[PDB]
């Protein structure tokens, strides 16, 4: 079968950064990262994940050892090097068979290469791997598949990525995956003997469109090409028609609460910046809309009731309240769609 699937996949002939080790920069994590490492026996233990890497957001630590692994989604404080400290909120400790499989044919020339891929779509951390003593120069050229090992629902926030080392007395092949459509050739035994990207080459686009490896001589209509608009303009009518907000907030004789002036605001453009610059507010609570989300909304009619009142009465004025003002002077309906402003 020649199944075609669209899923986050490291691009073919993509660009991979290669590091050395003799201090461990924090590489950004976005849309997964492909990882590879070749070694004689071992120089690497684990990785740490998350944002800000401190005791404030949940983090990850997947250090391996000689017999098992120490996967944990915890809020480690710091190590700067006994890999975590200041336990406050750890959870979900995962222990299984060790990831690192090392085999040697009575010699160190069979340096094992290990390819690891990690992703965090809708949580559900996925770890793929395949261990084999490949030719050992560097990243090979022959195709190799990746078998998922663990699939565990972390359900947290990951932004930055870091790797751990070993003790002692040429690795770090890092590439970033991208959302692409792929087609994979399946062996009759089920293993993937080949795969072709569908965003790399015109020949790849043709082979992908017919989901076949052998393309016969001829023309093939594959897709459509589009010149993406470089910029985006928004233009609206020159109308300004500033609302009388200025005269409702620049008044000098704001009526009392017992006789609350009610101003009917009609036929104007309600810009709220003239409201923001006119009063250093102390209570700008809203109920039916958002103070920020108001400059992009249309309304049929607007009422501005203005009255000067005491301090605690400001907190008194709200839908579903009580008091000498909320009962006898001014009662806000429980179904109020608007805002109050107190300065």
């Amino acid at each position: 079968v020649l199944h075609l699937t669209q899923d986050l996949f490291l691009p073919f002939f993509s660009n991979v950064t290669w590091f050395h080790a003799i201090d461990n920069p924090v590489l950004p994590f976005n849309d997964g990262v492909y990882f590879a490492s070749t070694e004689k026996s071992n120089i690497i233990r684990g990785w740490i994940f998350g944002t800000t890497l401190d005791s404030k957001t949940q983090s990850l630590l997947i250090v391996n050892n000689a017999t098992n692994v120490f996967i944990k989604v915890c809020e480690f404080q710091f190590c700067n090097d006994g890999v975590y400290s200041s336990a406050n909120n750890c959870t979900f400790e995962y222990v299984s068979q060790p990831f690192l499989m090392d085999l040697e044919g009575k010699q160190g020339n069979f340096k094992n290469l290990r390819e690891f891929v990690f992703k965090n779509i809708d949580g559900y951390f996925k770890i793929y791997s395949k261990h084999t003593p490949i030719i050992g120069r560097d990243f090979p050229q022959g195709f190799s598949a990746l078998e998922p090992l663990v699939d565990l629902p972390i359900g947290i926030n990951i932004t930055r990525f870091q790797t751990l080392l070993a003790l002692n007395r040429a690795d770090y092949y890092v590439g970033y995956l991208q959302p692409r459509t792929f087609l994979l050739k399946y062996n009759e035994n089920g293993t993937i003997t080949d795969a072709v990207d569908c965003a790399l080459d015109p020949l790849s686009e043709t082979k992908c469109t017919l989901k076949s490896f052998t393309v016969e001589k001829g023309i093939y209509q594959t897709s459509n090409f589009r010149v993406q608009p470089t910029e985006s303009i928004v233009r609206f009518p020159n109308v300004t028609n500033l609302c009388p907000f200025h005269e409702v907030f620049n008044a000098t004789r704001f009526a009392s609460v017992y006789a609350w002036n009610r101003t009917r605001i009609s036929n104007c453009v309600a810009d709220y910046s003239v409201l923001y610059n006119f009063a250093p507010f102390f209570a700008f609570k809203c109920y039916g809309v958002s103070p920020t989300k108001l400059n992009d909304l249309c309304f049929t009619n607007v009422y501005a009731d203005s009255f000067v009142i005491k301090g605690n009465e400001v907190s008194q004025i709200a839908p579903g309240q009580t008091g000498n003002i909320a009962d006898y002077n001014y009662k806000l309906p429980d179904d109020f769609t608007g805002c109050v402003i107190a300065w």
Binding site: L200, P202, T222, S223, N224, F225, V227, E231, R235, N238
Partner: protein, 182 residues
Amino acid sequence: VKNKCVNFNFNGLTGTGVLTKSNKKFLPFQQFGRDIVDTTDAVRDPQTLEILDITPCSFGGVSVITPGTNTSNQVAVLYQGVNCTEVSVAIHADQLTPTWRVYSTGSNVFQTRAGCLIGAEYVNNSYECDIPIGAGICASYQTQSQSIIAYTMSLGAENSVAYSNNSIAIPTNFTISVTTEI
């Protein structure tokens, strides 16, 4: 920003494409402009009171001409129905939706009546068609050492009859040919 594909949101109408100066006679009350199929064509500027047309940002279709993969891996790209100086600046500014970028050596530019061919070169000879491109152009795989060439149709071998007032050609011999019809 005129003479450039740009998302526009004129007074509530949203679309994509190129806007520039126009010579319409928008009556003062008129605000929108369309056509037979009523597709929004011209928009009056609400803050300038000038007339601008709206144009398909870029409408073509990519076709790939290739020989058998078992023969070669070289491919050539067809950009149907577009003056490919437009894509040439589009490739340069990298706003093209296609991500695969095939090389432009200057010799691989082809202003065909049926679009633009890229990744192939003119050969002013005339060979029988192998892959139909369109507009009387055919591509084929040939030795220089191997590449993809584009050339015009050769309708056949050039022959001239010898008609005269008293000239007859009479066959002195014959042949039997067995063809096939399926």
